[PDB]
């Protein structure tokens, strides 16, 4: 409700209310486990995405 109210209030006077950038994300691995470079491979392992259709929550920063 507050987000919508602020947005509409800014629109009324012709300003721009910029909402806060998202802080959480969902990541899903969609590619297989073969023919992968070392750097993306280790990054996926660190994110715990070691299989197709594996999903995790990630704190965006």
């Amino acid at each position: 409700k507050e987000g919508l109210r602020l947005k509409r209030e800014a629109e009324a006077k012709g300003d721009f209310y910029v909402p806060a950038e998202h802080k959480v994300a969902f990541v899903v691995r969609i590619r297989g486990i073969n023919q992968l470079h070392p750097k993306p491979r280790k990054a996926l392992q660190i994110l715990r995405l070691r299989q197709i259709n594996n999903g995790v929550f990630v704190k965006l920063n």
Binding site: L6, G14, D15, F16, Y17, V18, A20, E21, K23, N61
Partner: protein, 160 residues
């Protein structure tokens, strides 16, 4: 195959910088080095004694010995699947203090001081942790005297 002399391929690595040849300034010799300090290695071509090997140029090491005009440094070197802590005796001219450790020491000093001040003054213990830069927060942008400017792609012009 290549020859295996000490100074193979160091044509530019061991050269002086443009308009920086000549007499070596004396702060190099006035700097203080103590065992346990971290130093960057950057060969100075003007001094041919106590020169580090080209493999160690641009690496950081920890001092383990301090002689009259040189220091012993422990520098990590990768050899196949192990990292060897090699020991090298380098003269002061090829050495420079490393600021990375001093910054951390300053941060530790600041943390201890802040904790002590908070505890003495009865304040709650402060947050003394570095945190990654978080996504930007919500804010309002005003268009007063800043009206949006409508942009369009530009046509192709034959710039002969």
């Amino acid at each position: 195959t290549n020859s295996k002399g000490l100074r193979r391929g160091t044509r530019y690595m061991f050269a002086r910088d443009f308009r920086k040849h000549g007499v070596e300034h004396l702060s190099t010799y006035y700097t203080q080095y103590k065992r346990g300090d971290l130093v960057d290695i950057k060969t100075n071509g003007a001094f041919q004694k106590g020169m580090p090997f080209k493999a160690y140029h641009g690496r950081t090491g920890r001092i383990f010995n301090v002689t009259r005009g040189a220091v012993g440094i422990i520098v990590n070197k990768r050899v196949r699947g192990n990292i060897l802590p090699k020991r090298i005796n380098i003269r002061i001219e090829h050495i420079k203090p490393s600021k990375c450790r001093t910054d951390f020491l300053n941060r530790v000093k600041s943390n201890d001081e802040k904790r002590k001040a908070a505890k003495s003054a009865g304040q709650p213990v402060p947050a003394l942790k570095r945190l990654p830069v978080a996504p930007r927060g919500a804010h309002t942008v005003t268009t007063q005297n800043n009206e949006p400017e409508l942009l369009a792609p530009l046509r192709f012009e034959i710039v002969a």
